mmCIF file with all atom_site columns, C-alpha atoms in Angstrom:
data_model
loop_
_atom_site.group_PDB
_atom_site.id
_atom_site.type_symbol
_atom_site.label_atom_id
_atom_site.label_alt_id
_atom_site.label_comp_id
_atom_site.label_asym_id
_atom_site.label_entity_id
_atom_site.label_seq_id
_atom_site.pdbx_PDB_ins_code
_atom_site.Cartn_x
_atom_site.Cartn_y
_atom_site.Cartn_z
_atom_site.occupancy
_atom_site.B_iso_or_equiv
_atom_site.pdbx_formal_charge
_atom_site.auth_seq_id
_atom_site.auth_comp_id
_atom_site.auth_asym_id
_atom_site.auth_atom_id
_atom_site.pdbx_PDB_model_num
ATOM 1   C CA . UNK A 1 1   ? -14.773 9.022  1.073   1.00 11.70 ? 1   UNK A CA 1
ATOM 2   C CA . UNK A 1 2   ? -17.013 7.437  3.754   1.00 12.77 ? 2   UNK A CA 1
ATOM 3   C CA . UNK A 1 3   ? -17.300 10.157 6.502   1.00 16.27 ? 3   UNK A CA 1
ATOM 4   C CA . UNK A 1 4   ? -20.318 11.588 4.626   1.00 16.00 ? 4   UNK A CA 1
ATOM 5   C CA . UNK A 1 5   ? -21.880 9.862  1.600   1.00 16.55 ? 5   UNK A CA 1
ATOM 6   C CA . UNK A 1 6   ? -22.289 13.183 -0.263  1.00 15.95 ? 6   UNK A CA 1
ATOM 7   C CA . UNK A 1 7   ? -19.778 12.454 -3.041  1.00 14.89 ? 7   UNK A CA 1
ATOM 8   C CA . UNK A 1 8   ? -21.009 12.663 -6.642  1.00 15.13 ? 8   UNK A CA 1
ATOM 9   C CA . UNK A 1 9   ? -17.826 12.887 -8.807  1.00 15.27 ? 9   UNK A CA 1
ATOM 10  C CA . UNK A 1 10  ? -18.384 9.639  -10.780 1.00 14.93 ? 10  UNK A CA 1
ATOM 11  C CA . UNK A 1 11  ? -21.699 7.740  -10.722 1.00 13.07 ? 11  UNK A CA 1
ATOM 12  C CA . UNK A 1 12  ? -22.771 6.203  -14.098 1.00 13.29 ? 12  UNK A CA 1
ATOM 13  C CA . UNK A 1 13  ? -22.938 9.013  -16.686 1.00 16.69 ? 13  UNK A CA 1
ATOM 14  C CA . UNK A 1 14  ? -20.649 9.272  -19.732 1.00 18.87 ? 14  UNK A CA 1
ATOM 15  C CA . UNK A 1 15  ? -19.806 13.002 -19.440 1.00 19.81 ? 15  UNK A CA 1
ATOM 16  C CA . UNK A 1 16  ? -16.679 15.219 -19.708 1.00 22.61 ? 16  UNK A CA 1
ATOM 17  C CA . UNK A 1 17  ? -16.123 15.497 -15.931 1.00 23.29 ? 17  UNK A CA 1
ATOM 18  C CA . UNK A 1 18  ? -16.682 11.727 -15.726 1.00 23.81 ? 18  UNK A CA 1
ATOM 19  C CA . UNK A 1 19  ? -14.327 11.031 -18.632 1.00 23.63 ? 19  UNK A CA 1
ATOM 20  C CA . UNK A 1 20  ? -11.726 13.339 -16.984 1.00 28.07 ? 20  UNK A CA 1
ATOM 21  C CA . UNK A 1 21  ? -11.679 10.987 -13.953 1.00 25.02 ? 21  UNK A CA 1
ATOM 22  C CA . UNK A 1 22  ? -8.159  10.035 -15.083 1.00 23.48 ? 22  UNK A CA 1
ATOM 23  C CA . UNK A 1 23  ? -6.380  12.005 -12.297 1.00 24.72 ? 23  UNK A CA 1
ATOM 24  C CA . UNK A 1 24  ? -4.525  14.249 -14.776 1.00 25.13 ? 24  UNK A CA 1
ATOM 25  C CA . UNK A 1 25  ? -2.813  17.478 -13.719 1.00 25.73 ? 25  UNK A CA 1
ATOM 26  C CA . UNK A 1 26  ? -2.719  20.975 -15.302 1.00 25.08 ? 26  UNK A CA 1
ATOM 27  C CA . UNK A 1 27  ? -1.849  19.900 -18.869 1.00 23.99 ? 27  UNK A CA 1
ATOM 28  C CA . UNK A 1 28  ? 1.263   17.820 -17.980 1.00 23.36 ? 28  UNK A CA 1
ATOM 29  C CA . UNK A 1 29  ? 2.422   14.544 -19.570 1.00 21.35 ? 29  UNK A CA 1
ATOM 30  C CA . UNK A 1 30  ? 4.287   13.489 -16.381 1.00 19.06 ? 30  UNK A CA 1
ATOM 31  C CA . UNK A 1 31  ? 1.038   12.671 -14.490 1.00 20.06 ? 31  UNK A CA 1
ATOM 32  C CA . UNK A 1 32  ? -0.118  10.466 -17.385 1.00 19.33 ? 32  UNK A CA 1
ATOM 33  C CA . UNK A 1 33  ? 3.279   8.765  -17.278 1.00 14.95 ? 33  UNK A CA 1
ATOM 34  C CA . UNK A 1 34  ? 3.161   8.577  -13.448 1.00 13.27 ? 34  UNK A CA 1
ATOM 35  C CA . UNK A 1 35  ? -0.381  7.116  -13.257 1.00 12.40 ? 35  UNK A CA 1
ATOM 36  C CA . UNK A 1 36  ? 0.435   4.587  -15.989 1.00 10.81 ? 36  UNK A CA 1
ATOM 37  C CA . UNK A 1 37  ? 3.741   3.568  -14.365 1.00 9.81  ? 37  UNK A CA 1
ATOM 38  C CA . UNK A 1 38  ? 2.589   3.914  -10.746 1.00 8.17  ? 38  UNK A CA 1
ATOM 39  C CA . UNK A 1 39  ? -0.684  2.016  -11.338 1.00 6.57  ? 39  UNK A CA 1
ATOM 40  C CA . UNK A 1 40  ? 0.884   -0.973 -13.168 1.00 6.64  ? 40  UNK A CA 1
ATOM 41  C CA . UNK A 1 41  ? 4.565   -0.738 -12.281 1.00 7.13  ? 41  UNK A CA 1
ATOM 42  C CA . UNK A 1 42  ? 4.431   0.438  -8.659  1.00 6.94  ? 42  UNK A CA 1
ATOM 43  C CA . UNK A 1 43  ? 2.294   -2.597 -7.963  1.00 10.62 ? 43  UNK A CA 1
ATOM 44  C CA . UNK A 1 44  ? 4.539   -5.196 -9.580  1.00 10.79 ? 44  UNK A CA 1
ATOM 45  C CA . UNK A 1 45  ? 7.729   -3.072 -9.316  1.00 9.47  ? 45  UNK A CA 1
ATOM 46  C CA . UNK A 1 46  ? 8.465   -1.613 -5.888  1.00 11.09 ? 46  UNK A CA 1
ATOM 47  C CA . UNK A 1 47  ? 8.019   -4.571 -3.612  1.00 13.56 ? 47  UNK A CA 1
ATOM 48  C CA . UNK A 1 48  ? 10.009  -7.233 -5.459  1.00 11.90 ? 48  UNK A CA 1
ATOM 49  C CA . UNK A 1 49  ? 11.414  -6.101 -8.878  1.00 11.99 ? 49  UNK A CA 1
ATOM 50  C CA . UNK A 1 50  ? 14.820  -4.330 -8.722  1.00 14.25 ? 50  UNK A CA 1
ATOM 51  C CA . UNK A 1 51  ? 15.353  -0.586 -8.151  1.00 13.50 ? 51  UNK A CA 1
ATOM 52  C CA . UNK A 1 52  ? 12.698  1.000  -10.418 1.00 14.08 ? 52  UNK A CA 1
ATOM 53  C CA . UNK A 1 53  ? 12.550  4.801  -10.586 1.00 14.87 ? 53  UNK A CA 1
ATOM 54  C CA . UNK A 1 54  ? 9.236   6.747  -10.694 1.00 19.09 ? 54  UNK A CA 1
ATOM 55  C CA . UNK A 1 55  ? 8.802   10.310 -12.046 1.00 19.59 ? 55  UNK A CA 1
ATOM 56  C CA . UNK A 1 56  ? 7.280   13.111 -9.875  1.00 19.43 ? 56  UNK A CA 1
ATOM 57  C CA . UNK A 1 57  ? 4.888   15.692 -11.310 1.00 20.36 ? 57  UNK A CA 1
ATOM 58  C CA . UNK A 1 58  ? 3.622   18.940 -9.788  1.00 21.24 ? 58  UNK A CA 1
ATOM 59  C CA . UNK A 1 59  ? -0.057  19.984 -10.051 1.00 20.04 ? 59  UNK A CA 1
ATOM 60  C CA . UNK A 1 60  ? 0.896   21.271 -13.545 1.00 20.74 ? 60  UNK A CA 1
ATOM 61  C CA . UNK A 1 61  ? 1.417   17.566 -14.606 1.00 22.58 ? 61  UNK A CA 1
ATOM 62  C CA . UNK A 1 62  ? 5.111   18.131 -15.559 1.00 20.27 ? 62  UNK A CA 1
ATOM 63  C CA . UNK A 1 63  ? 8.133   16.448 -13.883 1.00 22.27 ? 63  UNK A CA 1
ATOM 64  C CA . UNK A 1 64  ? 8.589   19.407 -11.538 1.00 20.80 ? 64  UNK A CA 1
ATOM 65  C CA . UNK A 1 65  ? 10.632  18.499 -8.463  1.00 22.55 ? 65  UNK A CA 1
ATOM 66  C CA . UNK A 1 66  ? 11.453  14.769 -8.207  1.00 24.96 ? 66  UNK A CA 1
ATOM 67  C CA . UNK A 1 67  ? 12.771  11.823 -10.176 1.00 24.80 ? 67  UNK A CA 1
ATOM 68  C CA . UNK A 1 68  ? 13.780  8.856  -7.989  1.00 24.20 ? 68  UNK A CA 1
ATOM 69  C CA . UNK A 1 69  ? 15.076  5.292  -8.305  1.00 25.79 ? 69  UNK A CA 1
ATOM 70  C CA . UNK A 1 70  ? 13.163  3.023  -5.907  1.00 21.39 ? 70  UNK A CA 1
ATOM 71  C CA . UNK A 1 71  ? 14.901  0.036  -4.248  1.00 20.95 ? 71  UNK A CA 1
ATOM 72  C CA . UNK A 1 72  ? 12.863  -3.091 -3.345  1.00 23.66 ? 72  UNK A CA 1
ATOM 73  C CA . UNK A 1 73  ? 14.289  -3.713 0.190   1.00 25.28 ? 73  UNK A CA 1
ATOM 74  C CA . UNK A 1 74  ? 15.666  -0.485 1.688   1.00 23.93 ? 74  UNK A CA 1
ATOM 75  C CA . UNK A 1 75  ? 13.560  2.708  1.679   1.00 21.46 ? 75  UNK A CA 1
ATOM 76  C CA . UNK A 1 76  ? 16.479  4.585  0.026   1.00 21.63 ? 76  UNK A CA 1
ATOM 77  C CA . UNK A 1 77  ? 15.896  5.684  -3.574  1.00 22.95 ? 77  UNK A CA 1
ATOM 78  C CA . UNK A 1 78  ? 18.066  7.346  -3.994  1.00 16.89 ? 78  UNK A CA 1
ATOM 79  C CA . UNK A 1 79  ? 15.955  10.439 -4.749  1.00 19.21 ? 79  UNK A CA 1
ATOM 80  C CA . UNK A 1 80  ? 17.205  13.449 -6.739  1.00 17.74 ? 80  UNK A CA 1
ATOM 81  C CA . UNK A 1 81  ? 15.641  16.764 -7.832  1.00 16.81 ? 81  UNK A CA 1
ATOM 82  C CA . UNK A 1 82  ? 14.921  17.653 -11.478 1.00 16.40 ? 82  UNK A CA 1
ATOM 83  C CA . UNK A 1 83  ? 13.713  20.746 -13.358 1.00 12.38 ? 83  UNK A CA 1
ATOM 84  C CA . UNK A 1 84  ? 10.108  21.167 -14.558 1.00 12.68 ? 84  UNK A CA 1
ATOM 85  C CA . UNK A 1 85  ? 11.039  19.001 -17.593 1.00 12.08 ? 85  UNK A CA 1
ATOM 86  C CA . UNK A 1 86  ? 12.316  16.177 -15.343 1.00 11.37 ? 86  UNK A CA 1
ATOM 87  C CA . UNK A 1 87  ? 16.096  16.553 -15.942 1.00 10.20 ? 87  UNK A CA 1
ATOM 88  C CA . UNK A 1 88  ? 18.202  15.283 -13.018 1.00 9.63  ? 88  UNK A CA 1
ATOM 89  C CA . UNK A 1 89  ? 19.786  18.409 -11.489 1.00 13.57 ? 89  UNK A CA 1
ATOM 90  C CA . UNK A 1 90  ? 23.191  17.404 -10.109 1.00 12.00 ? 90  UNK A CA 1
ATOM 91  C CA . UNK A 1 91  ? 23.862  20.849 -8.587  1.00 12.54 ? 91  UNK A CA 1
ATOM 92  C CA . UNK A 1 92  ? 22.691  23.599 -10.967 1.00 8.99  ? 92  UNK A CA 1
ATOM 93  C CA . UNK A 1 93  ? 20.812  26.574 -9.506  1.00 10.76 ? 93  UNK A CA 1
ATOM 94  C CA . UNK A 1 94  ? 19.496  27.437 -12.996 1.00 9.84  ? 94  UNK A CA 1
ATOM 95  C CA . UNK A 1 95  ? 17.526  24.135 -12.769 1.00 8.84  ? 95  UNK A CA 1
ATOM 96  C CA . UNK A 1 96  ? 17.286  23.227 -9.057  1.00 12.40 ? 96  UNK A CA 1
ATOM 97  C CA . UNK A 1 97  ? 15.311  26.340 -8.069  1.00 14.00 ? 97  UNK A CA 1
ATOM 98  C CA . UNK A 1 98  ? 11.958  26.834 -6.264  1.00 12.11 ? 98  UNK A CA 1
ATOM 99  C CA . UNK A 1 99  ? 10.340  26.357 -9.714  1.00 12.83 ? 99  UNK A CA 1
ATOM 100 C CA . UNK A 1 100 ? 11.306  22.640 -9.565  1.00 9.95  ? 100 UNK A CA 1
ATOM 101 C CA . UNK A 1 101 ? 12.019  21.894 -5.885  1.00 12.17 ? 101 UNK A CA 1
ATOM 102 C CA . UNK A 1 102 ? 11.429  24.108 -2.842  1.00 12.51 ? 102 UNK A CA 1
ATOM 103 C CA . UNK A 1 103 ? 14.909  24.245 -1.259  1.00 13.37 ? 103 UNK A CA 1
ATOM 104 C CA . UNK A 1 104 ? 18.139  22.201 -1.697  1.00 10.15 ? 104 UNK A CA 1
ATOM 105 C CA . UNK A 1 105 ? 20.329  23.711 -4.463  1.00 10.20 ? 105 UNK A CA 1
ATOM 106 C CA . UNK A 1 106 ? 23.663  22.524 -2.984  1.00 9.24  ? 106 UNK A CA 1
ATOM 107 C CA . UNK A 1 107 ? 25.673  23.293 -6.144  1.00 8.77  ? 107 UNK A CA 1
#
C-alpha cells in the first residue's frame, strides 16, 4: 500500500494480530495448504515444472469452489469445481451447488 502511508498492520511488535499475519481464512486448512503450496510451489512450479494443481479456498479457509491442475505452457488447467471439502465434483448437484461454486452444475 503506497497511495497513503497510513498502514499499521505489521510494524515490529510480537502481538496476536502481528502473529496472525499468516493470511489465514475463517478457520480453514485449505488456506494454510494454499499459502504453503502457492508461496513455495507456485514460484518453482507453474512456470517450468509440469502441470501442478493448486487448491482453492473460500474466505472460510476450506476448499470451497476450485481445485485445478496448472499447465506450465498453456493457460489451460484444466480447472474443475469441488465441494467445500475440496472433492472434485464431476457433475453432482449435491456437491456442485452455490455452497461450493456459484453456477455451473452441468450434471
